[PDB]
Amino acid sequence: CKLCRSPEGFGPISFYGDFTQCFIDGVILNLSAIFMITFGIRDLVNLCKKKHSGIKYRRNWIIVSRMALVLLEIAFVSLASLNISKEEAENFTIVSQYASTMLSLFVALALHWIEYDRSVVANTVLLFYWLFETFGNFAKLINILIRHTYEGIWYSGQTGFILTLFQVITCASILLLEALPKKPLMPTRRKPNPYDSANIFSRITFSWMSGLMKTGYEKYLVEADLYKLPRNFSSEELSQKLEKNWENELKQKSNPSLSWAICRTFGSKMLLAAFFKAIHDVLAFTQPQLLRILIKFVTDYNSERQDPQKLPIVRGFLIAFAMFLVGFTQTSVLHQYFLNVFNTGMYIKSALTALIYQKSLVLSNEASGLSSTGDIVNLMSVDVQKLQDLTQWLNLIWSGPFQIIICLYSLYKLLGNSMWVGVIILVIMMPLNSFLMRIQKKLQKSQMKYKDERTRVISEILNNIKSLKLYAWEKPYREKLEEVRNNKELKNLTKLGCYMAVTSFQFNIVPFLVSCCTFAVFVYTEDRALTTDLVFPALTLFNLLSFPLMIIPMVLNSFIEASVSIGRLFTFFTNEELQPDSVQRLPKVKNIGDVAINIGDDATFLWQRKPEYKVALKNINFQAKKGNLTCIVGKVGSGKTALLSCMLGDLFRVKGFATVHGSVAYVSQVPWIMNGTVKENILFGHRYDAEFYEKTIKACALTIDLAILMDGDKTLVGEKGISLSGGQKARLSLARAVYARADTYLLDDPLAAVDEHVARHLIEHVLGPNGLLHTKTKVLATNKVSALSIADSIALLDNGEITQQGTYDEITKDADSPLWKLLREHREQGKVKWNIYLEYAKACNPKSVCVFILFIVISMFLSVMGNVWLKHWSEVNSRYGSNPNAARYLAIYFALGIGSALATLIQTIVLWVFCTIHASKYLHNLMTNSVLRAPMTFFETTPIGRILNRFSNDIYKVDALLGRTFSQFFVNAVKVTFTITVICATTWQFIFIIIPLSVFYIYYQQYYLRTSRELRRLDSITRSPIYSHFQETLGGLATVRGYSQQKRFSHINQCRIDNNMSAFYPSINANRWLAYRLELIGSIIILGAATLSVFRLKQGTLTAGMVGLSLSYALQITQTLNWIVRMTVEVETNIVSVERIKEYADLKSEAPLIVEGHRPPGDIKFNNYSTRYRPELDLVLKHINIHIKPNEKVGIVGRTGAGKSSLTLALFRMIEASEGNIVIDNIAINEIGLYDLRHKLSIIPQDSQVFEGTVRENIDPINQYTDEAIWRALELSHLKEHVLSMSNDGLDAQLTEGGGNLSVGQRQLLCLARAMLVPSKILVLDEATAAVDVETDKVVQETIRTAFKDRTILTIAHRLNTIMDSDRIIVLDNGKVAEFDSPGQLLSDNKSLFYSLC
């Protein structure tokens, strides 16, 4: 039996809404006290036990004030015990309460002192103890006050009431004085994370993000602003933990399993997250039950009040407050669950992204080559990502069914057996919905495929725009591009939009249709009346049920993907190691020459065992002296690289002992270059020491290349090393080696890939005995006699066997065949660019967008009227005892629901067809109309990479994602507008709540809009360097172990991961901070709506339907608010795409293609002509006045830096005249249409180009030249046999794009074919210093005559050999000019500058 004495037993909830006095005293204030006893003593001992004396804080007013309040509340509890004894204190609960509370207060008395001395964070246990004291004592105050105001009598007397009021005041004051104060300590690198100092309420409410959010709002963020990771997130510690557990799995268990390794390491946090998810589920499904209880209460009370122990109107207020407490606790526990799952996600990425790299540095060479570099890079750019994203969804494998089981139970409970119709409809939809997910994916991948197609077309067009513009091929390739786009890509996009509208229709109908069918079957099978307390809680429960059944299949999909990824990682970590004993290693030897620096005792070295045991380097005796050069010789691929690798350890020793002394340096067969500064590729982590740095760089004979380089050694080796070339690279690698001053040098053809002059330079400064490195051993593999002359010892190997070994004299005496032969924006946060939104609304038809919004409004209006009709129907069914006109009411409800569904279908169709696709088409046509139409200055100044990004990455987003982002934003904005409208209509004085909440909501969504955008950008920036670093390390994996620098490289990877987590942890915690603020705003809206509804009830003018409807709507604000804020962040992140498109679309352009001065279908004369290659540059041509007659085969010469190259651009107006002009046979170019000029003239480019597809379009794409003429041109250039052999199609033969499918001279002949094919009255020629084969070169030099016997020829050429045949010569001098007859006449006058070379 209950061991208490009170009319209101332990029953937690009294007849009135609030807790029974026995529950408050017996359970709440007793458990708080017992919690405080246990955990408070635990913390007391812990703080005393953890450290004998910690860095103390100033005992400022704070500590003394909270101390005083503890004493005050102790006084009040003592006074309560004194006061209540007489008033039947035999009721055990009161005495238990005061005993426990007195003991608890003493323990807190102590613990505040101890925490203030010993702990930085305001202790968790005191914050929660005082939260429960304030809560319990507030419950007691409310209980007393309710009993007073209802039953007329104070159950603890006037004194007990006021004393409890003081207890509540003291508890609240002490709780705030605990949580709020910052704590005085009375005592560059990024400041410590606030998550370490945040007390438990700050951890719950993520208010420790408020400082970062303020900074992100006030200014742009950079890695100087992001706080360091909190303690335990360092990739090194995470990787060590996971690696210890993984090693335990590998060695202590017979069947190791990486999945259990990860569980053993990071399972505790996921289990806690699962607990919080369970509590969240329970709360999410109690809240609809409180809605049902509130509606049932309202109808009971209203019926009684119209027309003993009548219900109290305080139960309505307590139920509204219960709704608020459930909302608040739900959001707190939910975001703790999210915090823990994402912390485990970042752990698993950091722990694995580092452990993969540490494994990579240990992989055997065989295995590393077996795996593709791209594969292994994916192994942590995708596979580890899957594991990270698996954690987010891991807990739904049980919270999925768990959130379904209790939802089905609740629906059965309240709505009866008919529920099964709704469950059946959702289940039936699940296959269909998943099938549409597959179809959406298929169409989206097709869209990405066509995006890649268009990206390739744009890539060629932009890359060789110079030529394309030069021939005037702008319009034909524009037509090609727009054909591809319009037909293949946008038709696919309309298909995607149609099925997107279908999926939106399903998404909107199914939650409606479930409820409609369930109410139908309920009405037509159940004898009960469909009361308004059954309709609305059922509707909320179906809305909740939507999500688990929506998500579970996607969870299983992510689960199978994660399982495959764990499989890949497991096969990786088990991948074969290099054996650490392949070569034993010893320190350096102090002496010189005498000692063997490295040894091989008849040892054998297999490349691998298990993939293939058969191949090995044979049993070799080998030696190398200290302070000498030992050289290795032999044919290519015979084992030189293997021998060197052996002392590098990449080969697998099986027999004989091998040893090497001291630190080593390695130069690979191909010199590895790591992206970064050239100075960095020299230093390679070794400290900068000038007097040796410049000596070394000189010795490596590339100071000339530093002089050529724009920024010298400070120049950045381009992404993936594209900036340098092999000649520089070999020298640079050897420079790294020498600068290391390694105790040994293993050199695999360090000097073979460069000219003999450079080789001799390196020999005489580095390798020769006089060289700066004489005291350091060299084991140099090569065959060049110059190098061999330095060798103190040599060995020749064939097929993995050293044929002979000895010094140079012995090699000489051997008389062997080879032996004899050998011997962006400022960081002030400027407001959003509304003008770009207007531009987009103009790209979408500005009336189509309004039709879109109109149909969104109709959809949501018809959903609201669906619920209002449901309210009317339920009020009728409650007025009557049974369902009076099921057919009528249900049919109208179905009509309204299908009205909403059709409104949404029209919404999405109008969006995708009229609005978004129209804008995409318009913007792309505008952008291509501008870019291709832009002058050559644009392309010279701007990176082709970025210009191509605008077309591939950027306009794709405006195509596909911006439209849906706007649609989600407006759907949810209208949804919330109508939800607020419904709640206000139910309680007009809700406006005074929504306005303050609206201000707070704008405040938070704005802070988040700026800071989450910045942190997402900054995470994106910091992400890639991890993968790029990994791929370069894979490429250079040999050298890294070479120098024995795996330590530094591993540490660089760790600090490449920690940077990412510094960028990420704030991002996801930003999501948490926003979501907490918005879910608490939602909880306050629930409280406002429910309490104002109860007030209207007390006024007696509330009907249960109104409260049911208003709250059934207010419950889903909690999610629609957060979803609006996510969509507004996303739309700001995308609309910058339209900004980037517009910035190109309006580019200033060259003169019009066409103008009245047409060429009706020839000789030329310059007239004081001048121009500059760049508008800010000085004139490259000045006062040019040359006259050329119609047939003269003119050539031109000039200084290397002269405008000789720039002339051709100047003639075709690619660079516009500064003053003067060029006149043609009868007309001046400055008023000729550019297309007319450009194509009536003819040209062969400075360098040729290749387009994808057939040669027909590379000779005549516009097809204005007849097939017979094309065939004749192929004859004249005799490419004909070549194209016919390439494919039977001959002149229409297919051609591969971008590859080395053709040697230069044949491309030049194809260009000449274009030239002779076009009927032209001028023909300009060009040629540039390049690796042209002399054969095809002379073929060109003779066929150029055959092209036009009579046409004027402006032969630009760097090859005077090409120029000498010219009949007239122009000499250009940095804008100055001289003109002459043929070169013989020119040189007959003076010893010309060029004649000096000739």
Q: Is 1205 annotated as a binding residue?
A: yes
Closest to 72 in 3D by CA, of 133, 30, 24, 144: 133
Residue 648: Cβ within 10 Å count = 25
Q: Sort residue 1199 into left (φ over 0), alpha (ψ -120 to 50) or beta.
A: beta
Rg (CA), the chain: 41
H-assigned helices in 574-633 = none
Q: Is 638 annotated as a binding residue?
A: yes
**H/E element, 999:** helix 991-1035
Query: CA-CA distance, 327 to 329, in Å (whole number)?
Result: 6
Per the CB < 8 A criterion, the answer to whether 257 and 570 are in contact is yes
SS3 544: helix
Q: Are strands 596-606 and 658-661 parallel, antiparallel or unpaired?
A: antiparallel
Q: Is 410 annotated as a binding residue?
A: no
SS3 1271: helix
Judging by beta carbons within 10 Å of its beta carbon (0-12, 13-18, 19+), is residue 121 exposed, middle or buried?
A: middle
Per the CB < 8 A criterion, the answer to whether 1145 and 1196 are in contact is no
Q: Is 1200 annotated as a binding residue?
A: yes
DSSP state of 1292: G
Per the CB < 8 A criterion, the answer to whether 1320 and 1351 are in contact is yes
Residue 992: Cβ within 10 Å count = 10
Per the CB < 8 A criterion, the answer to whether 1015 and 1074 are in contact is no
Q: How many whole angstroms from its chain centre is CA 1254?
A: 38
Q: Is 50 annotated as a binding residue?
A: no
| Exposure b/e, 1018-1040, CB count within 10 A at least 16 = b | bbeebbeebbbbbbbbbbbbbbb
Per the CB < 8 A criterion, the answer to whether 1207 and 1178 are in contact is no
Query: CA-CA distance, 1093 to 38, in Å (whole number)?
Result: 43
Which position has the token pair 């004299």?
Answer: 809
Residues 6 or more apart from 188 whose CB is under 8 A from it? none
DSSP state of 997: H
For 1242, list phi and psi in degrees, rounded to 5: -130, 170
Query: CA-CA distance, 619 to 654, in Å (whole number)?
Result: 10
List the determination method.
cryo-EM
SS3 681: helix
- Measured at the CA of 788, the angle between CA 784 and CA 789, to 5 degrees, comes to 120
Q: Is 1338 annotated as a binding residue?
A: no
Residue 383: Cβ within 10 Å count = 23
For 805, list phi and psi in degrees, rounded to 5: -145, 140
| Exposure b/e, 133-166, CB count within 10 A at least 16 = b | bbbbbbbbbbbbbbbeeeeeebbbeeebbebbbb
Closest to 1367 in 3D by CA, of 1165, 1192, 1162: 1192
Judging by beta carbons within 10 Å of its beta carbon (0-12, 13-18, 19+), is residue 124 exposed, middle or buried?
A: middle
Q: Is 253 annotated as a binding residue?
A: no
SS3 501: helix
Residues 6 or more apart from 622 whose CB is under 8 A from it? 598, 599, 600, 643, 795, 802, 805
Kindly report the CATH number assigned to the domain that includes residue 742: 3.40.50.300
Bridge partners for 664 per DSSP: 744
Q: Is 1199 annotated as a binding residue?
A: yes
SS3 689: coil
**Tokens of residue 654, six digits:** 């099986």
Q: Is 1082 annotated as a binding residue?
A: no
Per the CB < 8 A criterion, the answer to whether 297 and 285 are in contact is no
For 631, list phi and psi in degrees, rounded to 5: -120, 150
Q: Is 1203 annotated as a binding residue?
A: yes
Q: Is 637 annotated as a binding residue?
A: yes
Query: CA-CA distance, 644 to 660, in Å (whole number)?
Result: 12
Give the domain extent around 657: 584-821
Per the CB < 8 A criterion, the answer to whether 667 and 771 are in contact is no
HEC secondary structure over 1116-1162:
HHHHHHHHHHHHHHHHHHHHHHHHHHHHHHCCCCCCCCCCCCCCCCC
Residue 452: Cβ within 10 Å count = 13
Residues 6 or more apart from 1260 whose CB is under 8 A from it? 1270, 1314, 1317
Per the CB < 8 A criterion, the answer to whether 668 and 646 are in contact is no
**Tokens of residue 467, six digits:** 């030529």
Bridge partners for 665 per DSSP: 745
- Measured at the CA of 1210, the angle between CA 1208 and CA 1216, to 5 degrees, comes to 155
Query: CA-CA distance, 782 to 378, in Å (whole number)?
Result: 37
Which position has the token pair 């990412």?
Answer: 1060
**Tokens of residue 1012, six digits:** 């989450």
Q: Which amino acid is at 678?
A: V
Bridge partners for 584 per DSSP: 659
Beta strands in 1225-1303 (DSSP E): 1241-1243, 1253-1254, 1294-1295
Query: CA-CA distance, 36 to 123, in Å (whole number)?
Result: 12
Residues 6 or more apart from 757 whose CB is under 8 A from it? none
**Tokens of residue 595, six digits:** 């000692």
Q: Is 400 annotated as a binding residue?
A: no
Query: CA-CA distance, 590 to 592, in Å (whole number)?
Result: 7
Query: CA-CA distance, 1319 to 1233, in Å (whole number)?
Result: 18
Name the resolution in angstroms. 3.4
Bridge partners for 781 per DSSP: 632, 748
